[PDB]
């Protein structure tokens, strides 16, 4: 319902169920971004990159993988983080520092990069806009319901999705 917001979602096999576990949300247009993150001392590579990318206040999208947090994955996990963030950026043709990357689920487990690399090659801007309903679904881990809210403000459309019902007491900055 928000103008210039598309939603990509697709199975990459972060878990063997064929369910949507790989998501990208993007504004077809440049956007001001606000963001706050965990401050864990074990904060994974994804958090670090996101922080950078929101420095200038400019970002347009975010790629979100579920059923793997890519945390405590060492250097290999950092590279996989940069790789996947940059890849998604190039595919939709955007500056690196305008693509955020979020990653939830198992810790200390490497990505399925052969399968993620393969799906990266077919990544295209989706025709038509919307699809928050199925991003809400493709980000879930231990959730039992999808989480999505819609509100209209002075002619604009605001829509939010959320996930997480365990390992859960946020304290972000």
């Amino acid at each position: 319902t928000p103008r210039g917001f598309v939603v990509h979602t697709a199975p990459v096999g972060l878990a063997d169920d064929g369910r949507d576990d790989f998501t990208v949300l993007a504004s077809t247009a440049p956007a001001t971004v606000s963001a706050v993150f965990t401050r864990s001392r074990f904060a994974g590579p994804s958090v670090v990159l996101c922080r950078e990318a929101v420095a200038d206040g400019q970002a347009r999208g975010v790629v979100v993988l579920a059923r793997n947090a890519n945390v405590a994955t060492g250097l290999e996990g950092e590279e996989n983080a940069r790789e996947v963030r940059e890849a998604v950026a190039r595919a939709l043709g955007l500056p690196e520092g305008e693509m955020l990357i979020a990653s939830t689920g198992v810790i200390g487990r490497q990505y399925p990069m052969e399968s993620i690399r393969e799906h990266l090659k077919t990544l295209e801007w989706p025709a038509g806009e919307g699809g928050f309903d199925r991003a809400a679904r493709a980000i879930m881990t231990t959730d039992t319901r999808p989480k999505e809210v819609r509100v209209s403000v002075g002619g604009a459309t605001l829509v939010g999705i959320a996930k997480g019902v365990g390992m859960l007491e946020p304290d972000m900055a």
């Binding site: 504004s27 509100v151 604009a156 829509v159 019902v165 859960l168």
Partner: protein, 203 residues
Amino acid sequence: ALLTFFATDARLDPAEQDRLFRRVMDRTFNAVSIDTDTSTSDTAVLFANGLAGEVDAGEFEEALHTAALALVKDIASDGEGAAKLIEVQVTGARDDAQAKRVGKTVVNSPLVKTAVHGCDPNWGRVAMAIGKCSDDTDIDQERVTIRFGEVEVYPPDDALRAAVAEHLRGDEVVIGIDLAIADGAFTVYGCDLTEGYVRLNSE
């Protein structure tokens, strides 16, 4: 654990947008606990492309709040294997920071969480938990008041006892706490503790 992304087409001044976003996250996503396990991956983003024109910032913070608070309650109602939401309304603190401190400790008390799971208006455990805030020496146990629903149970007819029992049998339970110090106020959110939570996280 926590990922939440907001999207709007309203046009918003970058600076003013960042402030209203922090202010809202502080009263919403930074004010909820299911199991105190702050994660390695918590992420909360707001994208605002201007394809809808300028909108009054003070009205968008209201909407952003109502929206954030709606997801928060969803989160806490869907806490792993929970079965009731808990809302700790703390007031009369010396300030808000303290009022939050007190709500968190109350809402993270395993005995409080289990009492609530058991449909028990166990104010003595609420009191205990309040007591754990041992560096807050302006918390006077004689000036503290505790309530379940609208009904005040501390300090300590049959109709009000039935009112409270019905309140705790429900799925959204409200713990009100007045500290009688200053004007500090803050509400946090969490859930009961159940064997489902243990069973899921044990398996």
